[PDB]
Amino acid sequence: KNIESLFDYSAGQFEFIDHLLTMGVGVHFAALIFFLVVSQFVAPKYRIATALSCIVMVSAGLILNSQAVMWTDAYAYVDGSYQLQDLTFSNGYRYVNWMATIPCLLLQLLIVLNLKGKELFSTATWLILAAWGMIITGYVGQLYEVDDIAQLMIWGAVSTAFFVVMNWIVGTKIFKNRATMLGGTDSTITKVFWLMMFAWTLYPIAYLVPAFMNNADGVVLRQLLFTIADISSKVIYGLMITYIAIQQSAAAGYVPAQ
């Protein structure tokens, strides 16, 4: 059902896909430590933002590690190529970590934006529902990336309607609330939004690889696209978020941050 099941892979394609997944594990658990240590230097207000970054690091690192073992459990090097043995690998388990990390990524954005009370719970409910609708409709489409490519596009179309609306809600809250942020972070948050528009858009590109590159090098490209998009949406993003949390904690008079 996923194009990965359709192809044999050379030794170089297979251990490259393997090396991308194990490397992502190391990067995510290496940033987990960093997000853990620096949390003390964040005021109680924004401290949850760094904990969320710790959550997504482990959430992603566990799925990447799981994708790696499954990758090496499903294929066997036979007669000069790694051939599918049993059916254990699938991208579907990437969509199940998005359901969890995306709300965490989104929640820590509203926290640094200094939203609170009725607006925090309200804005968070519409963003998560929009996200979940985006991920769910996207999961239904990739189920046909091999069988029905027409269903892939229309489900990706419905998923894009949610993606666009979600971005519009994030962008609107960003520009209407940055004047409240401290330490000059009103300039930094804008760039994070642009970083967001960039890293998040790589996923639909990877989602469409089966449509314009249906072969073994397309599977390699998709993982590469995932890896690049996955470090920028979670690691770099979480790094930009922590800096803002620290900076505002200093401007607000929190010594450990100062």
Ligand X SMILES: *C\C=C(C)/C=C/C=C(C)/C=C/C1=C(C)CCCC1(C)C
Ligand Y SMILES: CCCCCCCC/C=C\CCCCCCCC(=O)O
Distances from the Cα of 178 to the Cα of 192, 233, 236, angstroms: 12, 21, 20
Cα dihedral: 23, 25, 30, 34 (round 10): 130
Q: Which is nearer to ligand OLC, 168 or 198 (CB)?
A: 168
State the binding string over 191-210 for ligand OLC (x if CB under 6 A, else -).
--------------------
Sign (positive or negative) of CA dihedral 194, 53, 60, 134: negative
CB 233 within 8 A of CB 131: no
Q: Is 237 in the site for Cl ion (CB under 5 A)?
A: no
**From 93, 175, 194, 198, residue interacting with ligand OLC (rule: CB under 6 A):** 175
* Residue in 191, 203, 180 with CA at minimum distance from that of residue 236: 191
Q: Which is nearer to ligand Y, 125 or 187 (CB)?
A: 125
**From 29, 34, 193, 243, residue interacting with ligand Y (rule: CB under 6 A):** 29
Three-state SS at 18: helix
Pick from ligand Y, Cl ion, ligand X, none: which does 26 bind, CB < 5 to 8 A by kind?
A: ligand Y
**Closest distance between ligand OLC and the C-beta of residue 163, in Å?**
8
> 84 φ, ψ to 5°?
-60, 130
**Closest distance between ligand X and the C-beta of residue 201, in Å?**
7
- Secondary structure (DSSP) of 64-116: HHHHHHHHHHHEEE-SSSEEE-S----THHHHHHHHHHHHHHHHHHHHHTT--
Residues of this chain that bind ligand X (CB under 6 A): 98, 101-102, 105, 134-135, 138, 156, 159-160, 163, 200, 203-204, 207, 230, 233-234
Q: Which residues bind ligand Y (CB under 6 A)?
A: 18, 22, 25-26, 29-30, 33, 45, 48, 65, 68-69, 72, 107, 116, 120-121, 124-125, 128-129, 132-133, 136-137, 140, 149-151, 153-154, 156-158, 160
